[PDB]
Write a protein that binds this ligand. Sequence first.
Ligand SMILES: [Zn+2]
Ligand SMILES: [Zn+2]
Ligand SMILES: [Zn+2]
Ligand SMILES: [Zn+2]
Ligand SMILES: [Zn+2]
Ligand SMILES: [Zn+2]
Lengths: 153, 74, 317
Amino acid sequence: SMAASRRLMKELEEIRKCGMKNFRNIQVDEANLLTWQGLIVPDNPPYDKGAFRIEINFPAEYPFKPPKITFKTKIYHPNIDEKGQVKLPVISAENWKPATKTDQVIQSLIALVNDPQPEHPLRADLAEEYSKDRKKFCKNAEEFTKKYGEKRP
Amino acid sequence: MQIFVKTLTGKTITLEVEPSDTIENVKAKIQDKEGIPPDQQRLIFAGKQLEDGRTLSDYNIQKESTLHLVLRLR
Amino acid sequence: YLGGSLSIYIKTNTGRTLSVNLEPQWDIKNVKEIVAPQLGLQPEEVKIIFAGKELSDATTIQECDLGQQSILHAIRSRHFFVHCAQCNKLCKGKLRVRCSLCKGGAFTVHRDPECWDDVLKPRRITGHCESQEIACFDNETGDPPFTEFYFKCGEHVSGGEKDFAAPLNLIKINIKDVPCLACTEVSETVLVFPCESKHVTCLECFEQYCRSRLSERQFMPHPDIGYTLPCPAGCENSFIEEIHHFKLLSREEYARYQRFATEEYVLQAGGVLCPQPGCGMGLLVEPECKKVTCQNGCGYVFCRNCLQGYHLGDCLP
Ligand SMILES: [Zn+2]
Ligand SMILES: [Zn+2]
Ligand SMILES: [Zn+2]
Ligand SMILES: [Zn+2]
Ligand SMILES: [Zn+2]
Ligand SMILES: [Zn+2]
C-alpha cells in the first residue's frame, strides 16, 4: 500500500500528461485511489467516434495482482460481458507480468475493441455472429453504439 | 538454545536442542515428553518432511523456529 | 561514536578466558605485546586468530569488522545480510567459523573466499585446530568432516560461543542503483531473484508480494526446496531455495506461512486433517486403512470419505 499506491499514482501522472486521443476524460475519485473512471473514443467504424465509459478498479495488491475493468456504458461486443466485465488476455491472472504499465494495458484493450477476437468469447452468440456474418454484425453494432454512448468532439 | 514443536491444535511444546542434533534426537525428546511412538512422528518445517538421518543445522533452524508435528499411524 | 571503547574476550589453548578491553585503533602487534605479558608468553611467540585468518600485526582493531564482547584467540608457535531473532529487521551480518569434530573455533582456513563464491555446503575445506593439543584428525575417520561457517548479527551485543542467525543470501546492497521491478524505485538494500534475468525487488515489495500471495495459500510447492515463491515475473526455475528470507515479515505473517506449509504438505502427501474444532491435526494414515483415529488428540473417528462420524454403512450423501 506504499510502493503500490505511489506507483499507481505515478502511472496516473504519466497517463495524465500523455493525453493520447483514444483515452480521454480521466476521472480519479479523490476518495479512493484504487478506482478510476475513463472515456474511450475508438477510431474504427463499428464503434465510430462513440465514447464508451469504463471503470478500472485496482486491487490492494496492485503491483502483483492484475486490475479489473468494467464497462458502465453498454456495448455490443463478443469479448465483453453483459454486466460490463471484459476478458483481456494481458490482464488475466494466468499471464500478467507486474512490470506491465497501465497505458500498455489500455492500448491493448483499445486494440481488442477495434478488432474483436472470437477465439475466447464471454458472449458466444455475438462471437459466432461476427465469425460467420460481419455486415449484419456491423449493423447491430453501429445501431447499438449510436443508441448508447455519448459522442465527444 | 530452544525450539518449539507445535501440534496443529495449538499445543506448543518447548524443547532444548542444539543445531548439531539429528532429527531422531528431536523425535526422541518429543516422544519422551509426550509419549508418542518414535515411528509415528513426522516433523514438518515449512512444508517439508525432516529426514531422520540429517540434523537441524542442515535445515538452518533458528532460535524458536516452529517445527510442526504430524503423526503417522502406519 | 557512543562509547568507542571496545571490550573483548580471549580464549587460549588452555581453559583460561581473559577479559580485555581496548581502543579500536591499537596495532595488532601491540595487542600481541599485550596478550604476551598477560599469560607470560614471549611477544615473538604469539599468533592471533579471528574468524579464521592469521591476523596482520599492523592492521587496526576497528578494521576487523568486530562488534562487542567478541572473542579472539592466541597461540605460541614462532556487506553481509542476516535475519536475527532478537532484531526483527535484518541486520548486517558477520562471518565466523567452527571446527566440525570438536565443535570449537580458532582454526586456520585454507582458501579464504571473498564473496559470490561456492559456499554453504557441509563438505568444503579442512583446517588445523588449536583445541585439544591439535587432535582434530580426519586421518582415522575416513569419512571427511570439514570446517563449517556461521553468521552473527552485528547490530547488537552477542554471545560468542553459539550465537547464530539466518543468512539471507538473496539480499544485496544496490551497488549499481538498480530499480526495484515492482515500484521502479531504486532502494539501497534490495533482493536479487534467482532467475536468469536477475530481477530485483525492494523490501516493501517483498513483504507486500508475500503477504498477498499468503492468505490464499498460493505458495508454489517444490519437494526439495519447500513451499516457496516464484519470480514476480513468474520466470521458470526461479524458486527461493532458502526459505528463511520469509522472516522479513513479522510473527503472524511468517508463522502462518509455517502453518499453511505444514497443512498443505499433509494434504498433498495423502494425510487428512482433524474435523473436531480447533484440532487441525494432520494424520498420515496408510492409504488402504480407512479407520481414522486422532493420535494423542481428540480420538474422533471419521470415514475420511465423508468427513462425518464413524459410520459402518457407506456415506451416500
Ligand atoms: Zn540481532
Ligand atoms: Zn577442532
Ligand atoms: Zn519495490
Ligand atoms: Zn525473473
Ligand atoms: Zn483431533
Ligand atoms: Zn464416510
